[PDB]
Amino acid sequence: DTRALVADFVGYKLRQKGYVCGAGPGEGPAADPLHQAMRAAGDEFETRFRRTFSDLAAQLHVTPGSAQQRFTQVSDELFQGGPNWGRLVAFFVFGAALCAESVNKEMEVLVGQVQEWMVAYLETRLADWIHSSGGWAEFTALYG
């Protein structure tokens, strides 16, 4: 569930920005209301902030060794004062932005690993909040 959502959104953004072409998650239109909801929300969020999250990603100067800690620090910041659906959208937009920045610096392993770290953060941190907030079905209702 969660892994599929992350893969779909990141895959969609990488294709949207012209970084990747062909078979894989995020290829073609959303197969699923949850996935459509996150694509639409991420897109809207990103047109507002323009280059903000790509600039933040670049400002981190990640290396293969520091990237997980830096990813985790940003994620913690975004969730200060508790999760809400908008901060969750920011978290996805930032994750995809960090994958794109890793492509720019040609660290291809991070494109995959950042996605792994997104899933683990969601499952170990935000899982309790999401469930009590009505789960992804509720997110879909509000952002779809």
Binding site: E44, R48, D55, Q59, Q73, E77
Partner: protein, 156 residues
């Protein structure tokens, strides 16, 4: 759903529609699903007349969105100088923090808007403010190659 209509008209820069909605009781502070108000949208899109009408009708100049973003962050980031002035005159907080601890001065410095950096400084912006990662506006200016702004911040 006057609030939704006000949000849409503010973003689209439709001056006449905004006045009608306000005169019909639309909530000047209505929030969208990202926490943005009509003032956030008009400030980001650069519609000055709408910014002024919203403020005159009671818009909260310091309203913050989901990540803490305020209308002044957006005006500073996008480089709208007249809107920055109008917001500051109306009580905008020069030191508000958003996202990662960015201050409007961080965003103007990174985006290379020199006059806005100076206006923010004259209004009390904290030159030494650090974002969550330790970076000051000076650091961001230099990293983005804006030497003019960096020198101004160093002098300050």
């Amino acid at each position: 759903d006057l609030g939704k209509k006000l949000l849409e008209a503010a973003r689209a820069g439709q001056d006449d529609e905004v006045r009608i909605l306000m005169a019909n009781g639309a909530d000047v502070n209505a929030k969208d699903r990202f926490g943005w108000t009509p003032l956030h949208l008009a400030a980001m899109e650069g519609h000055l007349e709408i910014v002024e009408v919203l403020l005159k009708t009671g818009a909260d100049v310091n309203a913050w969105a989901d990540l803490g973003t305020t209308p002044l962050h957006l005006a500073a980031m996008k480089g709208h100088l007249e809107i920055v002035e109008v917001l500051l005159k109306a009580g905008a907080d020069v030191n508000a923090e958003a996202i990662v601890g960015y201050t409007p001065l961080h965003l103007a410095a990174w985006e290379g808007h020199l006059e806005i950096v100076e206006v923010l400084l004259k209004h009390g912006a904290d030159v030494n403010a650090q974002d969550k990662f330790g970076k000051t506006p000076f650091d961001l200016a230099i990293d983005n190659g804006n030497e003019d702004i960096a020198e101004v911040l160093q002098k300050a």
